[PDB]
Amino acid sequence: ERIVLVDNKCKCARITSRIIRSSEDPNEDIVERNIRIIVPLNNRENISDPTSPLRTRFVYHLSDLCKETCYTYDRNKCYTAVVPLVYGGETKMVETALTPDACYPD
Amino acid sequence: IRVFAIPPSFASIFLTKSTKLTCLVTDLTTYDSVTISWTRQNGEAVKTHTNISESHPNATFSAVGEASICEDDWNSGERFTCTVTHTDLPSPLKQTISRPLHRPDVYLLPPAREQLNLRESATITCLVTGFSPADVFVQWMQRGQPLSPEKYVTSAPMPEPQAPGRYFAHSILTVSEEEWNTGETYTCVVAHEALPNRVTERTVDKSTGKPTLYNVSLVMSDTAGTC
Amino acid sequence: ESATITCLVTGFSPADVFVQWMQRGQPLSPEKYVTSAPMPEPQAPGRYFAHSILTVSEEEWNTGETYTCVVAHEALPNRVTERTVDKSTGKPTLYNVSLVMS
Amino acid sequence: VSEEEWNTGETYTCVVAHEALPNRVTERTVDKSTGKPTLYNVSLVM
Numbered sequence: 001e002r003i004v005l006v007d008n009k010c011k012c013a014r015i016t017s018r019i020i021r022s023s024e025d026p027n028e029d030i031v032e033r034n035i036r037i038i039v040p041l042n043n044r045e046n047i048s049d050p051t052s053p054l055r056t057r058f059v060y061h062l063s064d065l066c067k068e069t070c071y072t073y074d075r076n077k078c079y080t081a082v083v084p085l086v087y088g089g090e091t092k093m094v095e096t097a098l099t100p101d102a103c104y105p106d
Numbered sequence: 107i108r109v110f111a112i113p114p115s116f117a118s119i120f121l122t123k124s125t126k127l128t129c130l131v132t133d134l135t136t137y138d139s140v141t142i143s144w145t146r147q148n149g150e151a152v153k154t155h156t157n158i159s160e161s162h163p164n165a166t167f168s169a170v171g172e173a174s175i176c177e178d179d180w181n182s183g184e185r186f187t188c189t190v191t192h193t194d195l196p197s198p199l200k201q202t203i204s205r206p207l208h209r210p211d212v213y214l215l216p217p218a219r220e221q222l223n224l225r226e227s228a229t230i231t232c233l234v235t236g237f238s239p240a241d242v243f244v245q246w247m248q249r250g251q252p253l254s255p256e257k258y259v260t261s262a263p264m265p266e267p268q269a270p271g272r273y274f275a276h277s278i279l280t281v282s283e284e285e286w287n288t289g290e291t292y293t294c295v296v297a298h299e300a301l302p303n304r305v306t307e308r309t310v311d312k313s314t315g316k317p318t319l320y321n322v323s324l325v326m327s328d329t330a331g332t333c
Numbered sequence: 334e335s336a337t338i339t340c341l342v343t344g345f346s347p348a349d350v351f352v353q354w355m356q357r358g359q360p361l362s363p364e365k366y367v368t369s370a371p372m373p374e375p376q377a378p379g380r381y382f383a384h385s386i387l388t389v390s391e392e393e394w395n396t397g398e399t400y401t402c403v404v405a406h407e408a409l410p411n412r413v414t415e416r417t418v419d420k421s422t423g424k425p426t427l428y429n430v431s432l433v434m435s
Numbered sequence: 436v437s438e439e440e441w442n443t444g445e446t447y448t449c450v451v452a453h454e455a456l457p458n459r460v461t462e463r464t465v466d467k468s469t470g471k472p473t474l475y476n477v478s479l480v481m
């Protein structure tokens with residue numbers, strides 16, 4: 001019964017609006033926005049770069065997300081980085097899987 | 107024998123997908139099949155008038171040089187002239203028409219709450235402002251079907267005091283108050299020259315608007331990367 | 334960029350309407366606001382409607398200002414009817430904020 | 436007016452007649468919703 005206007009995945013916002021149906025009377029029925037936004041609370045500022053510090057200031061521009069480095073990982077997409085590896089004198093750069101269940105071989 | 111040269115409107119070039127470049131001559135003498143030549147710089151003349159006045163009680167013989175030509179022809183803006191060959195007036199009647207941008211700020215307003223309290227009807231207007239020139243097409247969209255011209259009224263554009271070049275036009279949609287309570291999405295559609303798609307689609311309904319209640323709910327979740 | 338207030342007037346049958354705009358209880362210059370000519374509605378051929386458009390700066394609208402619109406007509410009970418809005422002229426907009434530390 | 440009438444929130448406009456008024460008359464409105472300015476309630480659930 002609620003219309004999901006905007007569902008951005010990185011900001012993990014859920015812009016959805018619902019109307020409570022009133023009784024038999026002139027219309028004063030309440031229109032609501034059922035916005036339910038979720039914080040990671042432990043992710044870093046550069047989501048692709050693992051070597052970033054903790055992000056504390058989360059800026060949620062609600063008008064902007066309707067239509068910028070993004071907050072939480074999405075299981076559909078891959079956020080991957082390259083890490084150096086050494087067996088000796090040689091240095092080899094190998095792509096790594098930052099999050100499971102997203103880039104698993106399917 | 108009226109000397110008048112009227113061009114088509116830019117609202118008509120999309121509503122009807124046709125243009126007519128005419129020499130509006132009315133109150134002419136009662137002579138059938140008069141020779142009226144409306145020629146441009148290229149030299150092409152309009153077709154003879156058909157399905158038009160031949161005999162009327164008020165003696166207003168309307169001899170109009172209507173012809174179906176390409177809509178892009180007048181967009182190119184070639185100069186059009188009128189030549190009148192009439193037996194009553196040997197001197198030909200000559201008149202020439204010619205044509206000389208801002209993004210159309212077509213923005214939509216919800217009904218007032220006093221309309222809802224009265225319960226008589228509801229009114230919605232599309233504030234078509236900041237567009238130049240006055241040529242604009244205003245249409246209404248509900249339930250995926252174009253509303254009849256009877257239901258809605260679009261006012262003539264007027265000069266804007268803030269910007270002399272830009273004009274504003276308002277058009278109200280008057281509906282029953284019971285109809286607006288149910289969702290019909292009351293889509294607003296407009297057409298203007300300085301617009302990318304030639305159509306800007308605006309929408310107002312009861313679902314979208316100023317809400318009575320706001321519950322913003324955040325969880326300080328620790329399981330991240332799963333949304 | 335600006336704040337535009339639409340004064341929607343409907344229901345005058347003699348088709349002669351006159352609209353002013355008053356801010357802070359004092360009349361405003363006629364240049365700022367423009368009133369359209371009357372024309373009838375399709376629902377009621379006898380009645381007519383006209384619109385008054387005032388364009389004002391958005392920052393001034395952010396501050397609490399009256400921007401009262403007044404309509405003068407013979408058929409009115411007192412021949413003068415004034416209506417006003419504000420930045421908070423609508424419903425109180427109850428909040429329902431929830432914060433979770435789970 | 437009756438107490439129950441005010442809960443229904445009719446307009447109750449007031450007019451005054453005077454020479455010094457530029458319009459010779461002015462209007463004011465008071466309702467049940469003229470106050471209650473943005474009342475909030477915040478739930479902190481663990």
Ligand SMILES: *[C@@H]1O[C@H](CO)[C@@H](O[C@@H]2O[C@H](CO)[C@@H](O)[C@H](O)[C@H]2NC(C)=O)[C@H](O)[C@H]1NC(C)=O
Binds near residue numbers: 046
């Ligand atoms: C930090 O975020 C920036 C984006 O603002 C990214 O830097 C570049 O991202 C592109 C696309 O992934 C890569 O092709 C470039 O190689 C990145 N730049 C560098 C210097 O590596 C990236 O997501 C983050 N930067 C780093 C260094 O990880």
Ligand SMILES: *[C@@H]1O[C@H](CO)[C@@H](O)[C@H](O)[C@H]1NC(C)=O
Binds near residue numbers: 035036
């Ligand atoms: C917001 O309020 C409605 C009822 O008014 C409720 O059903 C809904 O669950 C609330 N939103 C959240 C996130 O709890």
Ligand SMILES: *[C@@H]1O[C@H](CO)[C@@H](O)[C@H](O)[C@H]1NC(C)=O
Binds near residue numbers: 478
């Ligand atoms: C919002 O108010 C509703 C009642 O309309 C209540 O059920 C709900 O729990 C409230 N939301 C909170 C406390 O987050």
Ligand SMILES: *[C@@H]1O[C@H](CO)[C@@H](O)[C@H](O)[C@H]1NC(C)=O
Binds near residue numbers: 477
């Ligand atoms: C918040 O306000 C609504 C509106 O009255 C109320 O129903 C709800 O129970 C309130 N919630 C809390 C936690 O106070």
